[PDB]
């Protein structure tokens, strides 16, 4: 049994709600949140910019000591950092942003990441402005990730077309 509460549960393993991901880590406290990272860790907008605003810029600062060792991610890649406030963990899971001419086939890569821990709250990879089409990022999540996920949709508009197109 965990914490997460009026989740619609697609699948054996995936979730999702109409939820405000800040709101829903404030709320959860989830060991693990993902975040819509670049390979910058540059929180400017959508999933980064409202996490890190959440944060009150502490994930920003501690992505810019982590970039400054280390280097950018891979497109597909990840890594653990903080969960601030919001969480114990964040996983910066970096999708494809078609809006750069991203392969959209790395998809599946980023998705993988998401199985090395056992249950987090994530939003849609690659969606919002990363320019991908949700309803594929959706499919490619179910196919993908087998540990559990509760996925956050921002829009209610399109959690209704997600729900109602889902196979
Ligand atoms: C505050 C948020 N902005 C964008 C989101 C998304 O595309 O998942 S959540």
Do not use: W
Not at 43 to 70: C, F, P, R, W
Not at 85 to 111: M, R, T
Not at 116 to 132: D, M, N, Y
């Amino acid at each position: 049994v965990n914490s997460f509460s009026g989740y619609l549960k697609l699948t054996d393993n995936v979730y999702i709600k109409n939820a405000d991901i800040v709101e829903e880590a404030k709320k959860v406290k989830p060991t693990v949140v993902v975040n819509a990272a670049n390979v910058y860790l540059k929180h400017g907008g959508g999933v980064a910019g409202a996490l890190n605003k959440a944060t009150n810029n502490a994930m920003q600062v501690e992505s810019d000591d982590y970039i400054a060792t280390n280097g950018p991610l891979k497109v597909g890649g990840s890594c653990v950092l903080s969960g601030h406030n919001l969480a114990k963990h964040c996983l910066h899971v970096v999708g494809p942003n078609v809006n750069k001419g991203e392969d959209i086939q790395l998809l599946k890569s980023a998705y993988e990441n998401f199985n090395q821990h056992e249950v987090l709250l994530a939003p849609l990879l690659s969606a919002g402005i990363f320019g991908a089409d949700p309803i594929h990022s959706l499919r490619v999540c179910v196919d993908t990730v087998r540990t559990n996920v509760y996925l956050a949709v921002f829009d209610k508009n399109l959690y209704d077309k997600l729900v109602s197109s889902f196979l």
